[PDB]
Amino acid sequence: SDKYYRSAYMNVDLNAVASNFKVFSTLHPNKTVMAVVKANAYGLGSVKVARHLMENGATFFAVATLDEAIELRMHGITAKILVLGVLPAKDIDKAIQHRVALTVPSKQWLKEAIKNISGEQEKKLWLHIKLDTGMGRLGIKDTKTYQEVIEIIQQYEQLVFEGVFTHFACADEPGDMTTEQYQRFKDMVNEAIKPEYIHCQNSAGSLLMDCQFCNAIRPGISLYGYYPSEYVQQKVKVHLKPSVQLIANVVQTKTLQAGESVSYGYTATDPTTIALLPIGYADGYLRIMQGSFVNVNGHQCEVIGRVCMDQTIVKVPDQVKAGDSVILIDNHRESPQSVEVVAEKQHTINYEVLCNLSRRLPRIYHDGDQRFVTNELLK
């Protein structure tokens, strides 16, 4: 548990994350829940959330990069880990060494990966084949090439065909694409022997459909308590618990008299108090947040002037003083400080709001009565 010396931090509720995970376990009781903790678990912290989820029965995680995988491995995570991106061929030995499964996006990739397998790392190379079934980006599109890759894997005892998966492009919105990909997926996967894991659903897909054919699900943002779109949120009645709060303590206040002003980038008409927050755009509270409202001791206050790199200014009631807690992002969907309202202010989606949260912010994890802190600057 790291120390921190600036009252600006994120509260991460691990009980909320464990509830969300159960919601998914409960919705799909016959499937393996492959917890997606890529991008540092969407800003919350891969390691701490992964440890926590393991203590609650998670046996499989998905990340974006091998760096993310080795990071969980260097911190005691022993569950299975699948890398969703394409590993540079050179690094194949490190995946083998660290027991990390890998995505095969193409035949070419597999062929180049084999060539870089020196014999120093002799454990198995677990492989999940990615299939392209719709808005084709990454993955194998034709069944023939798919059989050929499987056929290649079967020449080497060291390579295991552990999974096959696909990703939906529009599942968080109305349309027949998703169901069209699902059928395309089965049509590809049926023309060859099935591997252990068959997974096609993200958060949207898992909350909206059952997909009996896909024995593993990959919930993401919803683990952290957020709906992947308004459509899904208004569609299903499952309850997800937001897990994040962004907080800052007022460090100083000044009273402007009518006629006096302050220049952070504001002139007062009546007597007004201003509070100085030690948080700014380098923490991920972007400049475009100007004019948004934040919660001070219960009341909505306006963010004035411009947001600076390390400071933010707020028009507040006179009684507010140094030490008062300010909630910039709250843990409730129907809140003027919800991740969604902030995303709207940033003209983006909830994913990016959490992702912008910089390393300069400590993560303070809550589990029942327990409290623990991670401060990257001092790690």
Residue numbering of the annotated binding site for substrate: 137, 309
Strands 299-304 and 312-316: antiparallel
Q: Which residues contact 302 (CB under 8 A, 6 or more apart)?
A: 291, 292, 293, 314, 315
Among 9, 31, 38, 226, the active-site one is: 38
Among 107, 186, 235, 264, the active-site one is: 264
Using CB under 8 A as the binding rule, whether residue 93 contacts a copy of itself is answered as no
Question: Minimum CB separation from Na ion for residue 150, in Å?
Answer: 9
Q: Output the six-digit token pair for 242.
A: 């937001």
Question: Minimum CB separation from Na ion for residue 115, in Å?
Answer: 16
Can you give 194-218 as a three-state secondary structure string? CCCEEEEECHHHHHHCCCCCCCEEC
Binders of Na ion in range 350-369 (CB under 5 A): none
Question: Contacting a copy of itself (CB under 8 A), which of 288, 299, 300, 371?
Answer: 288
Binders of a copy of itself in range 8-47 (CB under 8 A): 38-40, 42
Using CB under 8 A as the binding rule, whether residue 123 contacts a copy of itself is answered as no
Binders of a copy of itself in range 174-203 (CB under 8 A): none
Residue ranges with strand state E in 24-158:
32-36, 60-63, 80-83, 100-104, 125-130
Binders of Na ion in range 128-157 (CB under 5 A): 153
Which residues are 365's β-sheet partners?
Answer: 12, 372
| Shorter beta-carbon distance to Na ion: residue 80 or 241 | 80
Question: Minimum CB separation from a copy of itself for residue 147, in Å?
Answer: 20
**Residue 264 is a catalytic residue:** yes
Can you give 152-176 as a three-state secondary structure string? HHCCCCCEEEEEEECCCCCCCCCCC
Strands 363-367 and 370-374: antiparallel
Q: Which residues contact 128 (CB under 8 A, 6 or more apart)?
A: 82, 101, 102, 103, 104, 162, 163, 164, 165, 195, 197
Using CB under 8 A as the binding rule, whether residue 227 contacts a copy of itself is answered as no
| Shorter beta-carbon distance to a copy of itself: residue 135 or 193 | 135
Size of the site for a copy of itself (CB under 8 A): 72
- Interacting stretch for a copy of itself, rule CB under 8 A, among 130-138, 145-153, 239-247, 364-372? 130-138
Using CB under 8 A as the binding rule, whether residue 222 contacts a copy of itself is answered as no
Report, as residue numbers or ranges, the catalytic residues: 38, 264
